[PDB]
């Protein structure tokens with residue numbers, strides 16, 4: 001059961017949880033990858049990795065993915081959380097040069113991941129390994145789109161670095177725009193496509209019903225993370241959180257801000273329910289009697305189904321993962337799974 005302040009009865013009643021059959025092997029294989037790529041200290045991997053639930057988060061989302069696609073996605077997701085931790089620690093310790101150099105290497109590795117598979121920075125080498133595998137599933141046009149999206153994500157992380165080093169809390173609207181980039185909304189959306197085995201043409205994925213369903217799934221995930229990660233973020237001097245923007249710029253108390261974030265999250269669900277109908281009608285229209293139409297219809301339907309699964313996977317992840325359990329830590333500002 002979930003605490004009342006975080007509970008979403010519509011998720012519990014109407015978004016039943018799903019789990020990909022590869023999850024048990026996924027859990028161990030990603031743990032071993034974190035150890036072998038030296039992305040976290042060995043003792044922290046053994047003590048904390050399974051409890052962080054990163055593989056569970058992906059296995060509740062990309063249902064139907066081939067096992068090797070899911071493995072690359074899960075390794076990438078675990079990497080992404082470690083990168084968020086590295087960025088945080090570079091900020092806390094004032095390592096502006098180390099951050100700048102990492103940022104530059106990630107831009108280069110994103111365009112040429114094979115060149116960086118054995119880089120001396122293990123964080124760069126692990127990024128490159130996951131991305132090179134992601135680049136092997138679909139035509140290079142998809143790879144180029146993933147790269148365009150992730151270049152933007154890296155720069156949003158750089159903006160967060162600047163904000164936190166200057167002590168700036170973004171305004172609410174500025175924050176909502178930035179959050180689509182720091183949460184990597186378009187990366188998770190891109191990854192729907194190798195999971196269903198089809199690169200969608202621009203005309204299909206830019207259809208208004210597809211686009212809006214994709215957006216709402218990610219807005220829910222990011223803002224629900226803001227709701228659940230607010231305690232650890234306040235304790236860690238993080239400034240990027242819708243609740244923090246509301247407290248800072250709209251003069252809300254903590255209780256009022258929690259209520260407002262909750263209401264915005266709830267609205268994503270019922271807006272998604274409306275647009276999902278339109279997205280599934282579009283999927284039906286794509287089934288025009290042709291083979292290609294059947295393929296595109298099935299891919300769109302699978303992708304919209306996984307946009308729905310993201311809601312339940314993110315919901316339960318936030319109650320299971322050790323990442324957010326700040327009340328258990330000796331130092332609330334320093335999670336035990338980060339290298340400090």
Ligand SMILES: O=P(O)(O)C(O)(Cc1cccnc1)P(=O)(O)O
Pocket residue numbers: 080081084182183184225229323
């Ligand atoms: O777990 P966290 O740190 O609350 C977070 O969700 C980590 C994260 C980063 C990017 C994508 N998904 C999760 P963040 O975005 O930093 O608020």
Ligand SMILES: [Mg+2]
Pocket residue numbers: 084
């Ligand atoms: Mg974070």
Ligand SMILES: [Mg+2]
Pocket residue numbers: 084182
């Ligand atoms: Mg972050």
Ligand SMILES: [Mg+2]
Pocket residue numbers: 225226229230233
């Ligand atoms: Mg957060």
